């Protein structure tokens, strides 16, 4: 096509729906991770993560409003993934990596799983 | 904006 | 902080989210341009559009699964819109700047009205 | 992957 591109626009979406998380504006549903639980967008989550891809395209699953994660899933790996959703940026550090990785494998977002691999490859 |  | 970033995550979420469209996966709107009607996230509309922001933050429209807007929308201009908001690529063309713009003016989209201004000026 |  003869398209212009806006440069900023997806960073710009991106930041618009973490603000639309933070303020807990139509979040359909509530990811429970142990003790822990964590509010977010169906569509977010299916656009980041294979896992929850074939989740919410499940006919019944798609209509649920709770989803409990596997009891081994580390609350705070989640949450360091599910802020890397929202923004593109990773806290990744030597006392949170192995829970990370463990988590970005069972949630199927090879990106983070390769990040993951190259920063403990780099330490042994 | 840009010719992408 | 001491994050790391992942260059083309809002982009690929971007990509994702427009997939989901395609297929009418958990579209939760349809939006009424005269006899024309387009399906969408309200999430991906509100982080795009003033106006979309304005009425889902609505303690009552934010609950309707109907929007019309006003009868002088054109359905092609809107339509160049939500393929904008859903790629960040704008197309926009002599034929249809005008519809363009005046879309783009009534959905709040001030980087849109911006290169529309701007195209306008050249041309004169 | 970038420092921010
Ligand atoms: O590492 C990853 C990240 C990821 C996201 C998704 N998401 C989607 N893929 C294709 N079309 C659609 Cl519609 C979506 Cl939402 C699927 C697999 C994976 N794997
Ligand atoms: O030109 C534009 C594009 C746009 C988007 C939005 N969206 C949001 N803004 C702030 N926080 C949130 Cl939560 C959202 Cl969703 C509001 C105004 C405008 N104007
Ligand atoms: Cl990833
Ligand atoms: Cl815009």
Redesign the pocket.
Known sequence: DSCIQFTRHASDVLLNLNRLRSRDILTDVVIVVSREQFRAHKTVL?????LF?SIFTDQLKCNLSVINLDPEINPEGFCILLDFMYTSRLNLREGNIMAVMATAMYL????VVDTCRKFIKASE | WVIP
Chains 1, 3 share one sequence.
Request: hydrophobic share 30%; with cysteine.
């Open positions: 299916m656009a980041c993560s294979g891809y199927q977002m090879e990106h």
